[PDB]
């Protein structure tokens, strides 16, 4: 059933060159391509949350898209909720992973005050996430979405489509994000057609990075295999502006 789990101040880290994804499905190679899209700004302040420290796992704004990343070994983070009022009055998007699969549903979910998944539990998705749900319009099932392992996701909501990008890499850091460039790949395009203004992270009963996308111009460097190996944020500094103008890293 629904139970109460619960406010602490935010910490901040730096997304040095993280949050870049392939802007489209067009193959390019051995070329510097200039594109305009919603990307995480370079060297920005990313909010670092500790959901378990006292439980504090707040609802955050979606804005124009969300940059989400986390590092762990136990796989405590299970999924996300995206919607508006996040109750039975509106359609909401529930994305939750388990050991063998991922289930994505859009329904009029009446979510719990402090929603979570139960390791030892109705159904697996219904344990502590919501009390009821009806009028389902979308259902999708596929393969799981989720030293230490760093998992990076970008969530966009454009013209009714909820677009998810992701990357999975090894990490050997404790306090902050890694340096270097790595682009996120398209994961799934979901033809849902709902309003998303806010979101929340679902845990199994924990820390994560949250940033936001901006209308930014980037110069992307594609190697001989069509992989992006670098990028320039054309609105970061005079040096980057010069590099973008001259099309040269």
């Amino acid at each position: 059933q629904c139970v109460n789990l619960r406010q602490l101040p935010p910490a901040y880290t730096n997304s040095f060159t993280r949050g870049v994804y392939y802007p489209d499905k067009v193959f390019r190679s051995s070329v510097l391509h200039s594109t305009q899209d919603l990307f995480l700004p370079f060297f920005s302040n990313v909010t670092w949350f500790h959901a378990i420290h006292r439980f504090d796992n707040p609802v955050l704004p979606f804005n124009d898209g969300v940059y989400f990343a986390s590092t762990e070994k136990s796989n405590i983070i299970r999924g996300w909720i995206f919607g508006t009022t996040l109750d039975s009055k509106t359609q909401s998007l529930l994305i939750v992973n388990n050991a063998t699969n991922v289930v994505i549903k859009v329904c009029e979910f009446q979510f719990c005050n402090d929603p979570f998944l139960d390791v030892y539990y109705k159904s697996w998705m219904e344990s502590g996430v919501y009390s009821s749900a009806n009028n389902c319009t979308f259902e999708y099932v596929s393969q799981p979405f989720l030293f230490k392992n760093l998992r990076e996701f970008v969530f966009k909501n454009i013209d009714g489509y909820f677009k998810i990008y992701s990357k999975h890499t090894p990490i050997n850091l404790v306090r902050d994000l890694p340096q270097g460039f790595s682009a996120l790949e398209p994961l799934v395009d979901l033809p849902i057609g709902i309003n998303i203004t806010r979101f929340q992270t679902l845990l199994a009963l924990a820390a994560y990075y949250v940033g936001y996308l901006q209308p930014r111009t980037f110069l992307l460097k594609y190697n001989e295999n069509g992989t992006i190996t670098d990028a320039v944020d054309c609105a970061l500094d005079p040096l980057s502006e010069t590099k973008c103008t001259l099309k040269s890293f």
Epitope: P9, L60, P61, K89, T197, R198
Partner: antibody
Framework: EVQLVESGGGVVQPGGSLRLSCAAS????????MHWVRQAPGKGLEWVAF????????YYADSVKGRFTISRDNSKNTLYLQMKSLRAEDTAVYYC???????????????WGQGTLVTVS | VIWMTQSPSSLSASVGDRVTITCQAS??????LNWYQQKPGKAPKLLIS???NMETGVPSRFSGSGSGTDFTFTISSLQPEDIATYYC?????????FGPGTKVDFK
């Protein structure tokens, strides 16, 4: 933990101008949009202006539209309101706030400042 | 612009009495109405959002409901600490607007 503090209030003559600011702390200011609300003595609440988290889109009440400008600086966590061509009718206590909003700004928590008095005479 | 009104503009009630406040919109705003409570010298506090959703920390004696143009705010049993001015506010569209405000006096 969360606070909003207004400053820059004072007394000006009609036709003059006054600039307000609000210092935000205890929360991720740069992820939320912000509102200005004013309340005259003996009167109810009146909404003034809204700015989105990225400092882009700006909205104003018709009663102040064309005279007031809303802006912000996310590197200093400070919200600003620039008041030009002030009238006697603009006398009010001005507040900065993060109003709970499930449609536009995506604000889950409702925050208010202390209020600063702006007098035009 | 959506115009808002409230009735009565003022009411008197004693402790234990049930207090109801009516907020009406000139336009249909579905379920996007906020209710605030203000005492002299302080900024307004949010009690109810989304027409009927209670905020964290708000006493169970407070409630409300409604949809479209006609909404009601209710205090099931007035306490001595509930003497305040209540406001309704719509956030269905921009600009945001507040109603006149209903003052609750102690009888």
């Amino acid at each position: 933990e969360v606070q909003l503090v207004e400053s820059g209030g004072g007394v000006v003559q009609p036709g003059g101008s006054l600039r307000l600011s609000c210092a935000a702390s205890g929360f991720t200011f740069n992820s939320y949009g912000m509102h200005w609300v004013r309340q005259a003595p003996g009167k109810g609440l009146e909404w003034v202006a809204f700015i989105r988290y990225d400092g882009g889109n700006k909205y104003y009440a018709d009663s102040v539209k064309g005279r007031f400008t809303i802006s912000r600086d996310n590197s200093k966590n400070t919200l600003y309101l620039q008041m030009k061509s002030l009238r006697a009718e603009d006398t009010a206590v001005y507040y900065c706030a993060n109003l709970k909003d499930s449609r536009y700004s995506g604000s889950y928590y409702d925050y208010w400042g202390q209020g600063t008095l702006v007098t035009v005479s | 612009v959506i115009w808002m009104t409230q009735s009565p503009s003022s009411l008197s009630a004693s402790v234990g009495d049930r207090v109801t406040i009516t907020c009406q919109a000139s336009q249909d705003i579905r379920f996007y109405l906020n209710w605030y409570q203000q005492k002299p010298g302080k900024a307004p506090k949010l009690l109810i959002s989304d027409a009927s959703n209670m905020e964290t920390g708000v006493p169970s004696r407070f409630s409300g409901s409604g949809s479209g143009t006609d909404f009601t705010f209710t205090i099931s049993s007035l306490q001595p600490e509930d003497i305040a001015t209540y406001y309704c506010q719509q956030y269905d569209n921009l600009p945001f607007t507040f109603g006149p405000g209903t003052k609750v006096d102690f009888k």
